[PDB]
Amino acid sequence: GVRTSPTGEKVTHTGQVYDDGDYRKVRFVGRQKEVNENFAIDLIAEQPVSQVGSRVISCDGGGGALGHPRVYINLDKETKTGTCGYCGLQFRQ
Amino acid sequence: ITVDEKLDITTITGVPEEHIKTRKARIFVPARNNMQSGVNNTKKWKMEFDTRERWEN
Amino acid sequence: EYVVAKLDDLINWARRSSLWPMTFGLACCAVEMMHMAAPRYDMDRFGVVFRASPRQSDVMIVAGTLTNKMAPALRKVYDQMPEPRYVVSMGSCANGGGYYHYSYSVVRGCDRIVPVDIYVPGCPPTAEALLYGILQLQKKIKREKRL
Amino acid sequence: ASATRFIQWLRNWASGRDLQAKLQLRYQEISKRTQPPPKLPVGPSHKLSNNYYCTRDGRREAMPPSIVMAVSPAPPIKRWELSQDEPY
Amino acid sequence: ELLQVLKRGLQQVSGHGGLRGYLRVLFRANDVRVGTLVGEDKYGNKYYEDNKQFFGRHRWVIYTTEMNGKNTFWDVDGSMVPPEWHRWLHCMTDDPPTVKPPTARKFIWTNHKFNLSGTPQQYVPYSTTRKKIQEWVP
Amino acid sequence: TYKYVNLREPSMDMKSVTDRAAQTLLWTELIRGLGMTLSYLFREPATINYPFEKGPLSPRFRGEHALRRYPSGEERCIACKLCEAVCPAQAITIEAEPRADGSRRTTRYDIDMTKCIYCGFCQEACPVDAIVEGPNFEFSTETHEELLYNKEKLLNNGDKWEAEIAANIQADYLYR
Amino acid sequence: VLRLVMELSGEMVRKCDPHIGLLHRGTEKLIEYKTYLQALPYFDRLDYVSMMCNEQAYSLAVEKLLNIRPPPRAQWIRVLFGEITRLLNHIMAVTTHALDIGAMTPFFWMFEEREKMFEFYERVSGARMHAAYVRPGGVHQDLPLGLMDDIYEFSKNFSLRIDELEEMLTNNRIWRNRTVDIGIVTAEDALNYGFSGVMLRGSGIQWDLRKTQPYDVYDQVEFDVPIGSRGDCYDRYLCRVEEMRQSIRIISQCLNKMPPGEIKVDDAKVSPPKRAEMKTSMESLIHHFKLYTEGYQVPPGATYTAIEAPKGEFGVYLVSDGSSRPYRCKIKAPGFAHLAGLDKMSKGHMLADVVAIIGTQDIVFGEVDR
Amino acid sequence: VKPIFSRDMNEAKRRVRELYRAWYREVPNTVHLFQLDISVKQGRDKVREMFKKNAHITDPRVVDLLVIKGKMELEETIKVWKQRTHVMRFFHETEAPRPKDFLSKFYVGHD
Amino acid sequence: TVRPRNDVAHKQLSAFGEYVAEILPKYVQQVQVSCFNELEICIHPDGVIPVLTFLRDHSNAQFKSLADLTAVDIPTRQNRFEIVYNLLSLRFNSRIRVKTYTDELTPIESSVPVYKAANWYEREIWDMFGVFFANHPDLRRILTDYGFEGHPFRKDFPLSGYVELRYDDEVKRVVAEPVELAQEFRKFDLNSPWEAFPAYRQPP
Amino acid sequence: VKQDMPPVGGYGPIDYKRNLPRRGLSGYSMFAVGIGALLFGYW
Amino acid sequence: TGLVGLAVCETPHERLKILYTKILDVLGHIPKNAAYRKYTEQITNEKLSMVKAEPDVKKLEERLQGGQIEEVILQAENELSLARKMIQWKPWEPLVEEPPASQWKW
Ligand SMILES: NC(=O)c1ccc[n+]([C@@H]2O[C@H](COP(=O)([O-])OP(=O)(O)OC[C@H]3O[C@@H](n4cnc5c(N)ncnc54)[C@H](OP(=O)(O)O)[C@@H]3O)[C@@H](O)[C@H]2O)c1
Ligand code: SF4
Ligand code: SF4
Ligand code: SF4
Ligand SMILES: [Zn+2]
């Protein structure tokens, strides 16, 4: 997902390329760097924007099973879709 | 019986290594937070010592 | 040659078959150490015996908390051990101090006194996880003693 | 021999009655995956009306009264009689 | 009575292979016992359980020969068993690929990795510090 | 309700004295001690062969730290630092930053196994249910560096155990 | 584990000074910087064995500060698990005592039974041993539906299991030669030493804690307290075996009497709210947010509790301010009480007699923390 | 009317003289019976540097408390308890200290 | 009402707040406190032995047993240490607290002739706090190291200590001591604003 | 709903002892076997 | 007969009567106006009136004592030592020692 560095070591969730003059690179010589294949930033845009009929909708993961506090999002603004503070899920109308 | 009352300044007997003379104490009452508008952290004296060197490990 | 390489496997297999431990108590961990003897999670199924034998023993399992008072006590024992020796830090205290890391009297996790080969992570180190203190140790014996 | 029929006679013979209640004893009536999803009951709260914290004081009466500066601390601890199930 | 127990042992050897079958199980595993098989697992693990036998009888989870590239035939530990240990081996009742399957998320890895040890591809720590930048230029 | 221990000399005359004297001249109680151990040999050994048979466990078990995520990607953790404050070992370290796109999430997330007494407060103090304790034992290492878990990089490798985690959490909501 | 500096005049021990405190983990100062909910699992790790007998003494001491009676059901969990610790503590009190002497079999006989005992702990709480379960808000999590049938099934099979020890160890000529007449202390000096556990209870003095001072729904449950005749190790052994026999009766009566209802304290100002409840309503989530980070805000003052341990007394002495941090608490565990007696217990006794003293008193080295 | 610990003003100094007399005779016992380690001469110099720190005599209570403390930390080696050269080593030998100077401490890193 | 605890034996136990006070010494009594069926009496340090001989074998108050000998360290007062003698009666079934006060370095009259268990707890206070006790036989360090500086509990010095780090360095047998570096303890500044409790606040 | 049903029938040992005489107690009987084995032995 | 503690398994009647008559003379030496003399006398004479009323009765031994007759004598054996210590070191009559500094509230 993330772009590979010219030095060798792969970048994490945040832009974390180790400096050429930095000595803290010996750790990844011999043994591999653990970098996650699935990046969360690209997965937000991958999920489609759902449509809402009413003015205000409440967001939930899946009831009491999936962890989410019930947050109501106002959908008065036409430009830029409304999103909850927990999920990357967006809502229109 | 046998009082032997002597008036003198207090001294440290059960004391650690040479670090007491260098470090300076700041006995000052803690100020109320900017966001929290409640007086309970105040009205009680706090003796906090001056912070030394800190670095990322 | 090929004959020497196969002979070195037999020497490694001699330790891989049987390991006789000097298990240190001085912990809540010591009860979970005693659960190795418990029939449900059998350890005498391996070449491991609870006879201890302090002078003879090979793999000392340091279970739990190491205080400053017991710090010179465990070090002098480790010196008396025979040369093929391994150290298993059992429990979060023996790793790096689970609790009591910021306490004055506790040494911060064995390695500052005695070098550790295999780390057992769990506070109550479950007899499931403790069988990685034997089988993973037996797996780790490759050595590659060439010359 | 490993046959249970002949062995059960030997273990019953050598000190005390056995047969039932084995060493392993995890054959029957051991429920795996516990149960179907249950509903946990609510206490004297949850149901609305007359649920004030004014009535449910909790941490209110705590202030210690300073006292003064033949009486016993309690009626003396009388000894209890021997057990009816077993005398000794 | 003794003849019936001897016949049960001979039938057990005839069940799992034979002369070459039972000998392969006796050398690799601690004890050889016959039972009903679950079968379905990524990297051919047997997991033949279901038998009443004794206490905690989710018996015989036989490890696959070379799961990823370790050649586990003479030496094998509990490094195997891809996401099925909670049901077929420990806690739950229903078999993972037969009765109750785990729900798809499209985030979990399809191939399960072995135990992290002294071998390459081992764990290593790092910090998220961006650091306070210093400015010096001609 | 007052039991007693001592019998206060049961022997009196002839019949009650000689049988008590019999277990000192000859043994008998040694044979009676032999009898209980004899019956104990013939009953089957309750042993579990570790790499093939496994010991019984619970639906809610604490042992391995791994942070869960939503079904449609997206990191579930919010960086409240709530789990940091409850942590009795003060093991879990957390630095919070905005992810430049509105959402407030994590940057540094180290839960060192040198500390942590596996109490499971962080499992029960998380409002979003990010840290769920996976039933795992397979994490014995050679070094400290290999043991202490880094900033999400080894914890989002707990996605390989998330098939069990999503099934075991079905006992958590509406408790057991 | 223990130093035990011996002064041998010839063969008999004259001056036995136990130079203990070799495991001073420093629980005293370390708790001062932690809140009441945060400092809870420390007292599990006080003793090696007790988990629901421990924390029980602490949670009731916090309850005495907060003036809160726990729910009726939670108290019945506290006795059911309080007695199952009383069963667990006396396993080690016999087996490791036998292991220190040289008995090989009876150690393993109870440890298979003990491993089946921790299956009850596992299914009720995530950890194997040290379970953060008995909390200031009564009981954290409810019993699963599977366990209540398995508790009865275990106690049915335990009847013959406890009979194994009395048909093996008590009737032996070796034990009646060894353990009989070592440190015969029945005197009123033992009151001055104040052992309170099995020394006073198992010899002469009728007094205990369970009957005189009820803590969680007592008098309703029937008890038989074993009291010996002489102050020797063998009478202290037999009363513990009779305590093991008179503990299943408490468990069975707990199985008969289970009132269905709430688990945590009804007030959400002390007990953390349920997960299904906290995710919807505002008041609950704030209370969930504030019961973590911050403690409880305890009323200032000093409380003292001592719920009867199989080893002795967990004398919790919490000193409290208006803040959420308890500034110095002390649990004077039976360790300091029993090790004080060894100056009198060892006088005119052999080296091997000292080994028998430590086991029957059950000097667990974890007790020496405060 | 007031506590005096052990001695009043003058006799407390004689207790230090009594403490120095006893501890001067115990340094051959901490070499032959215990372990050689350093030297007999350097062991007696280790005593002098300890008492030079306690040059601030102002109260009879402070002096006597140091005598009672001295009758335990130096009494530990008389009736030999577990130390085994790792413990009971007062002089720092493993760590090298930085000298008190405005040019030396600033170059290395202090305050 | 469900949730609080009820008290009824408070008035019966308050009689001792008069009984011991009616003996009336300035040598002993000073201040008497009683709350939630427990008695706290704070006694002048000069008399401790004659105080503990009373409540022992006395016909009205027969305690005989000492369970706890805890000590409270508090920097607010000139008298720094508040040593609490916790007594338990087995004949009358009641608990009492014999509190005292001692400053920075003053000996108290130790209860060795009164109680035979006191000596072990007396050694513990001298270790943790540094409070010396007069008329005590063999005062030794138990919990501390045989070469430990200061007193482990005292609120003057930090939680981590001073000689915490112990290496097996270049010297073959000698374990290092004087190095003072350690991993940082995150001292969380948690203290809730607004006073939660009435009948506790005092006017300046 | 989570509840407990009492299955009480055989509660266990309520001060009950299973220590029963087995294989014939001595007194005078085992001595007659003992001396009897000697008399049969010598003859 | 068998006593609970290490105290001798014997019941000596009138020996208890000697000890209680002796301590009444001990109390009347220095304290006369002090309450320690006032409170101890009204308990001891209350017990003496009940001992003289019933001889060698199990109910008489149970009167505010609980245990055996030898245990009740042991509960009065060190009471003579407590009375003798009160005579030598006396806080009952005088009150002169210094009050503490005004700080006790936490
Ligand atoms: N006091 C003195 O003896 C003295 C006097 C004057 C100068 N020096 C100098 O100071 C140094 C002191 O070292 P030492 O003599 O104490 O070392 P040493 O004890 O002889 O040990 C040498 C170690 O280095 C490794 N090694 C050496 N050469 C190697 C090679 N070509 N390839 C791979 N591994 C190699 C060996 O490992 P493997 O066994 O795995 O190969 C061996 O364990 C010497 O180099 C010497 O020049 C010493
Ligand atoms: S790791 Fe846990 S069980 Fe082991 S010694 Fe430490 S606190 Fe005790
Ligand atoms: S793990 Fe949970 S409580 Fe901790 S920061 Fe993440 S979301 Fe918040
Ligand atoms: S399990 Fe407990 S000790 Fe471990 S990280 Fe979570 S809160 Fe901290
Ligand atoms: Zn959402």
Short mmCIF file of C-alpha atoms in Angstrom, two decimals, chain D residues 7-78:
data_model
loop_
_atom_site.label_atom_id
_atom_site.label_comp_id
_atom_site.label_asym_id
_atom_site.label_seq_id
_atom_site.Cartn_x
_atom_site.Cartn_y
_atom_site.Cartn_z
CA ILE D 7 -9.88 -53.92 36.89
CA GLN D 8 -12.96 -52.36 38.59
CA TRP D 9 -13.06 -55.36 40.96
CA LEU D 10 -9.39 -54.79 41.97
CA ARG D 11 -9.72 -51.03 42.70
CA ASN D 12 -12.88 -51.67 44.77
CA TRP D 13 -11.10 -54.42 46.75
CA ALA D 14 -7.95 -52.45 47.66
CA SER D 15 -9.18 -50.06 50.41
CA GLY D 16 -12.57 -48.31 50.12
CA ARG D 17 -15.44 -48.33 47.62
CA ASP D 18 -14.76 -46.75 44.21
CA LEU D 19 -16.40 -47.63 40.81
CA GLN D 20 -18.35 -44.33 40.49
CA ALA D 21 -16.61 -40.90 40.41
CA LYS D 22 -13.44 -41.44 38.34
CA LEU D 23 -10.03 -39.70 38.44
CA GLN D 24 -10.68 -37.93 35.12
CA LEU D 25 -14.47 -37.55 35.69
CA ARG D 26 -15.12 -35.38 32.59
CA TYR D 27 -17.31 -37.69 30.46
CA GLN D 28 -20.96 -36.65 30.90
CA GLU D 29 -22.73 -33.40 31.93
CA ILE D 30 -19.85 -31.16 30.78
CA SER D 31 -21.50 -28.37 28.77
CA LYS D 32 -19.32 -26.94 25.98
CA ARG D 33 -19.90 -23.37 24.67
CA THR D 34 -21.78 -22.72 27.98
CA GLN D 35 -25.36 -21.86 26.89
CA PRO D 36 -27.55 -19.95 24.36
CA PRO D 37 -27.16 -16.11 24.75
CA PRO D 38 -28.79 -15.08 28.09
CA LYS D 39 -30.32 -11.81 29.37
CA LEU D 40 -28.79 -10.39 32.57
CA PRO D 41 -31.41 -9.03 35.03
CA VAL D 42 -31.47 -5.44 36.36
CA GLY D 43 -31.46 -4.48 40.06
CA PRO D 44 -33.64 -2.00 42.04
CA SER D 45 -32.63 0.75 39.56
CA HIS D 46 -33.04 0.86 35.71
CA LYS D 47 -36.85 1.06 35.99
CA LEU D 48 -37.74 4.78 35.95
CA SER D 49 -39.58 6.94 38.57
CA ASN D 50 -38.39 7.37 42.20
CA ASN D 51 -34.75 6.58 41.30
CA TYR D 52 -33.19 9.66 42.93
CA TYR D 53 -29.65 9.64 44.35
CA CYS D 54 -31.07 11.72 47.25
CA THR D 55 -32.68 8.49 48.53
CA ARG D 56 -29.75 6.26 47.46
CA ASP D 57 -27.20 8.11 49.64
CA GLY D 58 -24.20 5.75 49.30
CA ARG D 59 -21.38 8.03 50.46
CA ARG D 60 -23.04 10.63 52.72
CA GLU D 61 -22.92 9.59 56.40
CA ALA D 62 -19.15 9.42 57.00
CA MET D 63 -18.17 12.29 59.36
CA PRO D 64 -16.49 11.06 62.60
CA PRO D 65 -17.78 12.51 65.92
CA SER D 66 -15.15 13.39 68.55
CA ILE D 67 -16.17 11.85 71.89
CA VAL D 68 -15.51 13.33 75.37
CA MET D 69 -11.79 14.25 75.21
CA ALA D 70 -18.97 0.19 84.38
CA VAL D 71 -19.45 -0.56 80.67
CA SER D 72 -18.59 -3.49 78.38
CA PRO D 73 -17.68 -3.15 74.65
CA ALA D 74 -20.28 -5.83 73.79
CA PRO D 75 -22.25 -8.59 75.57
CA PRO D 76 -19.50 -11.22 76.27
CA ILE D 77 -18.89 -13.87 73.57
CA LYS D 78 -20.77 -16.90 74.92
#
